[PDB]
Amino acid sequence: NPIHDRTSDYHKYLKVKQGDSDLFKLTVSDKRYIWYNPDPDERDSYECGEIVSETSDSFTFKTVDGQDRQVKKDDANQRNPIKFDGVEDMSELSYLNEPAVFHNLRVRYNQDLIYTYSGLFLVAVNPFKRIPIYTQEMVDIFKGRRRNEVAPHIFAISDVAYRSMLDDRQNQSLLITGESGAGKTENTKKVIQYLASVAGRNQGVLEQQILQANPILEAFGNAKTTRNNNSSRFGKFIEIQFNNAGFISGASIQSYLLEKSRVVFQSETERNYHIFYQLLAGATAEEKKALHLAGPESFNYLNQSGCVDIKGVSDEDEFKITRQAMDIVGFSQEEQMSIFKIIAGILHLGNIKFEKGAGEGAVLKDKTALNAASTVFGVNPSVLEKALMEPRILAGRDLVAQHLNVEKSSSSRDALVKALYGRLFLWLVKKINNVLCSERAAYFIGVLDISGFEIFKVNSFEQLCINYTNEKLQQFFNHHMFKVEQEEYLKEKINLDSQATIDLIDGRQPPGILALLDEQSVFPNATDNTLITKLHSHFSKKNAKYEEPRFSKTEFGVTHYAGQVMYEIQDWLEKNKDPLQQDLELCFKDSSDNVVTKLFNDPNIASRAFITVAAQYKEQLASLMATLETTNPHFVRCIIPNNKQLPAKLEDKVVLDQLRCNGVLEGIRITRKGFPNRIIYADFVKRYYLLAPNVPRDAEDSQKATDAVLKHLNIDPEQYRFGITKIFFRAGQLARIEEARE
């Protein structure tokens, strides 16, 4: 059994290597240490310090430097005894302090061990390199083991989900969140992998299509940013559908907040969506000519960032893969073509050059790209031309065609483009869903791949959505963790801020941000100023989660869970309306093209429902939360080790900052207050039997033994609770016990 075979790749890559002896003595030391801050300004940077002595209320220790120092016992960060370096769950630690949690992690990361439990969480640090732990071999080892049976691993947590579904006939959900670049999507993909393997019906297609869904999505929804070479520019929730028996029967997809802006603008050194690049790189010569195709350097929407390729990535090779998944999934050859055409047309539209002079109006001296795009799209260029610069507009009675300047003309085109893409994307999802989704499913396991809190330099409307979402999810956790912790105290017979923030945002009466925003969105002439004035009007000095800046006249601050956040209001009105000239709809509505027409002729795709972008999102979240609320949840927190996509570089500031945002640290804090340590009686005795002159290592009266020792040592009755099964210990208690003689 590779589980007990200490020479297996399982032991090799997932386990902390075991020696020939397990004897308590190995680990005996004379030393006691303290975690300290060599420099008080950097609070996240710590050194180990050897406690030298103690007074009644303080410790005194010995710095790295030789200097001596003094500490209040009640403020001190004691180091756990070395036996604890590497434990598979942070909860086994006795001293639960920040540095302490960091250290265990680190210790694991040093051995490439990237996964650790922290009570309910599975913590996962991105390694920045390939570890062969996701093999079929690996897969089959996880089938049916309990969480204590096996090493931490995304496979494990998913197996647990699966058995629970079967054994409780309850639906499940794994929540996978964290910063850009931390790993979410990888692991997300693993889960499906694993699932489709233990529970698929292979001697199969489904399974195939299901797997193939992602690639498709990623091509259209992922991009190369500064933070990651393959970032998901969208949120998503996967539902794996099963039948009563337990076999996979289908699935569905839900996307949230696609980054439409990226289509028409990419920050420096980043890239647009992959497709554009795959297309340019793998289209046949017959496809190129058919699509007026060229190099990226030739296309305004592609050539600006000054990045057109990813190191160690072949846009050409990726296209084949994509092309392949479209096949498996069920895209006709035509459909594929149309997709492309669109992708091309978009590019063309972006090349359209608007000059002036004549008046202030815009004109089209060159008509090239206009033609191309027109063609590809299957619409009347003149019509479109017109729709672009001479949109007719309602002056109420008067429908009168407005002639636009160059910027506004340029802007309309951009909107066009974003609509095109955003719809197309939806269209894909729906498409896929048609193929995979099962009306009649008995159970499911839902996977959420979404970012955690986003706090940049510049925080926009988009981030407000993400953080909102994040507050809702965080609170869900807290609720949950609370029941589940309360359940354990009974089974063993042993003895809020979120809402306010939530309210400020989404509240109806009184109204929160979203509400005020929405309100302003019926007024055509309202401006960002109008809006921000309204907000401060309502919350400044009146709401404690709100903050009116002392000088900025464009921002406000919301006090999130993760901490305070400054939002810039620039363009919220536009973002919330997500406008598009009717003439354009019309224009495109008469397309010759199959798909194209769909994107404008199907309400499901073409329209929000009159609905705001905010409102629509608010609804979307509501539902998600609702469904989640019906499942049993698993939480996975993904952690980026550093900022530079390196390996073997686990940065203290970077990691802790994450553990603070994502709740891992509070979980500890709160758990810390109780009886963090809860050992199985028999186990205690195994290690500790030699400390109290009495007892044998083995015993049927384990509870009696656990007692004799506790009695021996003369431990404070307050430091522990007798569980029916487990002995419940208070913080530091065990560490001391472990610090006793043989």
State the catalytic residues: 180-181, 185, 228, 231-232, 452, 454
Angle at 631 between CA 628 and CA 636, to 5 degrees: 75
Provide, rounded to whole angstroms, the least separation between the CB of residue 702 and Mg ion: 47
In this chain, which of 78, 193, 214, 232 binds Mg ion, going by CB under 5 A? 232
Tell me: is residue 492 an annotated ligand-binding position. no
SS3 34: strand
SS3 729: strand
Provide, rounded to whole angstroms, the least separation between the CB of residue 638 and Mg ion: 9
Provide, rounded to whole angstroms, the least separation between the CB of residue 451 and Mg ion: 8
189 binds Mg ion (CB under 5 A): no
Of 97 and 214, nearer to Mg ion (C-beta) is 214
Cα separation, 421 vs 398, in Å, equals 32
Cα separation, 114 vs 124, in Å, equals 6
Handedness of CA 406, 407, 408, 410 (dihedral sign): positive
Of 233 and 618, nearer to Mg ion (C-beta) is 233
Of 160, 170, 169, give the one whose Cα is nearest residue 195.
160
Piece of the chain touching Mg ion by CB under 5 A; list 21-29, 232-240, 273-281, 567-575: 232-240
Of 184 and 560, nearer to Mg ion (C-beta) is 184
Give, as ranges, the residues between 652 and 671 that touch Mg ion (CB under 5 A).
Answer: none
Q: Answer left, alpha or beta for residue 186, where phi above 0 means left and psi between -120 and 50 means alpha.
A: alpha
- Cβ neighbours of residue 598 closer than 8 Å, sequence gap 6 or more: 427, 605
Q: Residue 236 phi/psi, 5° resolution?
A: -160, 155
Element (H, E) at 444: strand 443-451
**Residue 185's CB: how many other CB atoms inside 10 A?**
20
Binding-site residue total for Mg ion (CB under 5 A)? Answer: 3
Of 283 and 640, nearer to Mg ion (C-beta) is 640
Provide, rounded to whole angstroms, the least separation between the CB of residue 183 and Mg ion: 8
Cα separation, 612 vs 517, in Å, equals 9
Copy the structure tokens of residue 704: 């009696």
Provide, rounded to whole angstroms, the least separation between the CB of residue 641 and Mg ion: 16
Of 209 and 232, nearer to Mg ion (C-beta) is 232
Of 219 and 532, nearer to Mg ion (C-beta) is 219
Tell me: is residue 183 an annotated ligand-binding position. yes
Cα separation, 663 vs 228, in Å, equals 23
Tell me: is residue 179 an annotated ligand-binding position. yes
Tell me: is residue 305 an annotated ligand-binding position. no
Provide, rounded to whole angstroms, the least separation between the CB of residue 178 and Mg ion: 9
Piece of the chain touching Mg ion by CB under 5 A; list 19-27, 48-56, 230-238, 648-656: 230-238
Q: Residue 674 phi/psi, 5° resolution?
A: -85, -115
SS3 123: strand
Angle at 323 between CA 320 and CA 324, to 5 degrees: 85
Cα separation, 322 vs 278, in Å, equals 9
Piece of the chain touching Mg ion by CB under 5 A; list 98-106, 231-239, 626-634, 702-710: 231-239
Of 232 and 521, nearer to Mg ion (C-beta) is 232
DSSP 396: T
Provide, rounded to whole angstroms, the least separation between the CB of residue 134 and Mg ion: 17
Of 180 and 438, nearer to Mg ion (C-beta) is 180
Q: Residue 404: CA atoms inside 13 Å, Cβ hemisphere, count? A: 20
Piece of the chain touching Mg ion by CB under 5 A; list 224-232, 510-518, 526-534, 695-703: 224-232
**Residue 656's CB: how many other CB atoms inside 10 A?**
21
Cα separation, 252 vs 307, in Å, equals 34
**Residue 296's CB: how many other CB atoms inside 10 A?**
20
**What is the distance of C-alpha 137 from the center of its chain?**
27
In this chain, which of 184, 341, 560, 618 binds Mg ion, going by CB under 5 A? 184
SS3 273: strand
The angle, 0 to 180 degrees and rounded to 10, between the axes of the packed helices 333-349 and 368-377 is 160
In this chain, which of 185, 463, 581, 612 binds Mg ion, going by CB under 5 A? 185
Provide, rounded to whole angstroms, the least separation between the CB of residue 640 and Mg ion: 12
Amino acid at 713: L
Provide, rounded to whole angstroms, the least separation between the CB of residue 472 and Mg ion: 20
**What is the distance of C-alpha 477 from the center of its chain?**
15
Tell me: is residue 249 an annotated ligand-binding position. no
Of 125 and 535, nearer to Mg ion (C-beta) is 125
Piece of the chain touching Mg ion by CB under 5 A; list 64-72, 176-184, 419-427, 658-666: 176-184
Q: Do residues 606 and 585 make contact, with C-beta atoms less than 8 angstroms apart?
A: yes
Piece of the chain touching Mg ion by CB under 5 A; list 22-30, 72-80, 178-186, 661-669: 178-186
Copy the structure tokens of residue 530: 């109008």
Tell me: is residue 181 an annotated ligand-binding position. yes
- Binding-site residues for ATP, please? 178-185
- Binding-site residues, please? 178-185
Instruction: State the residues that interact with Mg ion by CB under 5 A.
Output: 184-185, 232
